[PDB]
Design an enzyme around this catalytic site. Structure first.
Site, PDB file in Angstrom:
ATOM      1  N   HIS A   1     -27.480 -12.606  33.600  1.00  0.00           N
ATOM      2  CA  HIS A   1     -26.456 -13.137  32.725  1.00  0.00           C
ATOM      3  C   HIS A   1     -26.477 -14.658  32.647  1.00  0.00           C
ATOM      4  O   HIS A   1     -26.535 -15.248  31.549  1.00  0.00           O
ATOM      5  CB  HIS A   1     -25.081 -12.564  33.162  1.00  0.00           C
ATOM      6  CG  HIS A   1     -23.921 -12.835  32.243  1.00  0.00           C
ATOM      7  ND1 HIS A   1     -22.972 -13.813  32.551  1.00  0.00           N
ATOM      8  CD2 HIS A   1     -23.532 -12.191  31.114  1.00  0.00           C
ATOM      9  CE1 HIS A   1     -22.070 -13.761  31.578  1.00  0.00           C
ATOM     10  NE2 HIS A   1     -22.365 -12.809  30.685  1.00  0.00           N
TER      11      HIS A   1
ATOM     12  N   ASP B   1     -20.714 -18.658  36.576  1.00  0.00           N
ATOM     13  CA  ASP B   1     -21.330 -17.405  36.146  1.00  0.00           C
ATOM     14  C   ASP B   1     -22.049 -16.741  37.346  1.00  0.00           C
ATOM     15  O   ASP B   1     -21.684 -16.966  38.495  1.00  0.00           O
ATOM     16  CB  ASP B   1     -22.337 -17.798  35.014  1.00  0.00           C
ATOM     17  CG  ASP B   1     -22.775 -16.734  34.028  1.00  0.00           C
ATOM     18  OD1 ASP B   1     -22.878 -15.559  34.421  1.00  0.00           O
ATOM     19  OD2 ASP B   1     -23.084 -17.090  32.873  1.00  0.00           O
TER      20      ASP B   1
ATOM     21  N   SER C   1     -19.710 -13.963  25.644  1.00  0.00           N
ATOM     22  CA  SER C   1     -20.276 -15.003  26.510  1.00  0.00           C
ATOM     23  C   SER C   1     -21.314 -15.817  25.730  1.00  0.00           C
ATOM     24  O   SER C   1     -21.327 -17.045  25.805  1.00  0.00           O
ATOM     25  CB  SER C   1     -20.986 -14.372  27.705  1.00  0.00           C
ATOM     26  OG  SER C   1     -20.070 -13.821  28.641  1.00  0.00           O
TER      27      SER C   1
END
Lengths: 289, 92
Positions: free
Chosen positions: A69, A29, A229
């Site tokens: 994120h 990620d 996600s």
């Protein structure tokens, strides 16, 4: 009293205090804020980084933005307060830049790094979380298929394009557990004019709207995020819990457990295009009792 | 039977970088030699190439920065299974 999503995955406060401790979850990620109180000590930042340059010559690389994120997803998997599998160790690899963009080649090099790391120092069962998507890629699908055949469990986001997941990768790789997103009303998540992907390449759905998790804005901050996600991160946490309780499970057996323990027929199929209704699994992930 | 593949979503393509995938049981020594043979053949035609990475462990092959003009030549290299142009992935 409890985030809606943790209540949703509990069979009818969040009880499991150290779930998933035999499993290691690798996260491909963005960068992560490894000293955030929610995930400090639980996530080990590897030396791996392979990212493209950000778009726009005057981009400002602020750590709070770059880490948003990945930090939230690491929290969903193993977070102290709001995580699914609070005993699972995580290892992070950076394959997405500050704008959340990566390359298929960087992702391939990262998947190789995971296998090399395992061969050098084996531990328990491994779960790899790929909260990313690109167009259908023969090479990315093949790399995922080979890592799955080598005994590693892969979990990926179905994609946020309100489209058939078979047109994206790694979503379209059959050996990968591909996860769509549902909301608090158990309906498919809308994201602007798009939303969760669907179709025969999706294995199951999981909570993916307004998910409380670690915010990289400050060491104790929390923020809600939505997307496939976040849904995939719930399944990576549930898989870490199932594999830690039954470590001898093969990939086929684990997939069977995920389907068996899911809530069935709670999604209104009218949200999907007509021809996709019979092809999309009407399953929302849950923990075993 | 070696084939070339590129992303169907044209704005997500990343031309100029290619993943050369070799047949399943190709050994690392053979992958390195094939990458060096590509550089030599490309240089005889006046083209620069850069081998960014040599793969081993899951998929044998290598990552090369080169003109796509060299793709017909590269598909004829020993051990080649297929070649894919690099492309973008996005956080979901």
């Amino acid at each position: 009293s409890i985030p809606w999503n943790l209540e949703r995955i509990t069979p009818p406060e969040y009880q499991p205090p150290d779930g998933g401790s035999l499993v290691e979850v690798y996260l491909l990620d963005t960068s992560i804020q490894s000293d955030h109180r929610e995930i400090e000590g639980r996530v080990m930042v590897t030396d791996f980084e392979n990212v493209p340059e950000e778009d726009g010559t005057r981009f400002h690389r602020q750590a709070s933005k770059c880490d948003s994120h990945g930090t939230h997803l690491a929290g969903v998997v193993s977070g102290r307060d709001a995580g699914v599998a609070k005993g699972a160790s995580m290892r992070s690899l950076r394959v997405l830049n500050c704008q959340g963009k990566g390359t298929v080649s960087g992702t391939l090099i990262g998947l190789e790094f995971i296998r090399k790391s395992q061969l050098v120092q084996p531990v328990g069962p491994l779960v790899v979380l790929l909260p990313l998507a690109g167009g259908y890629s023969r090479v990315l699908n093949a790399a995922c298929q080979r890592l799955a055949r080598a005994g590693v469990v892969l979990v990926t986001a179905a994609g946020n394009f309100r489209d058939d997941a078979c047109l994206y990768s790694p979503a379209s790789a059959p050996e990968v557990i591909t996860v769509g997103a549902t909301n608090a009303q158990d309906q498919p998540v809308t994201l602007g004019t798009l939303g969760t992907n669907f179709g025969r390449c999706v294995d199951l759905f999981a909570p993916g709207e307004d998910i409380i998790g670690a915010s990289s804005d400050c060491s104790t901050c929390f923020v809600s995020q939505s997307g496939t996600s976040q849904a995939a991160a719930h399944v990576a946490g549930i898989a870490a819990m199932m594999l830690s309780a039954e470590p001898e499970l093969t990939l086929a057996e684990l997939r069977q457990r995920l389907i068996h323990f899911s809530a069935k027929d709670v999604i209104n199929e009218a949200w999907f295009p007509e021809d996709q209704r019979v092809l999309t699994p009407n399953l929302v992930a849950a923990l075993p009792p | 039977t070696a084939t070339f593949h590129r992303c169907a979503k044209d704005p997500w393509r990343l031309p100029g970088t290619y993943v050369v995938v070799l047949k399943e049981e190709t050994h690392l020594s053979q992958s390195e030699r094939t990458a060096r043979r590509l550089q030599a053949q490309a240089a005889r035609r006046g083209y620069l190439t850069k081998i960014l990475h040599v793969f081993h462990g899951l998929l044998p092959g290598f990552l090369v920065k080169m003109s796509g003009d060299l793709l017909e030549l590269a598909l004829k290299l020993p051990h080649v299974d297929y070649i894919e142009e690099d492309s973008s992935v996005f956080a979901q």
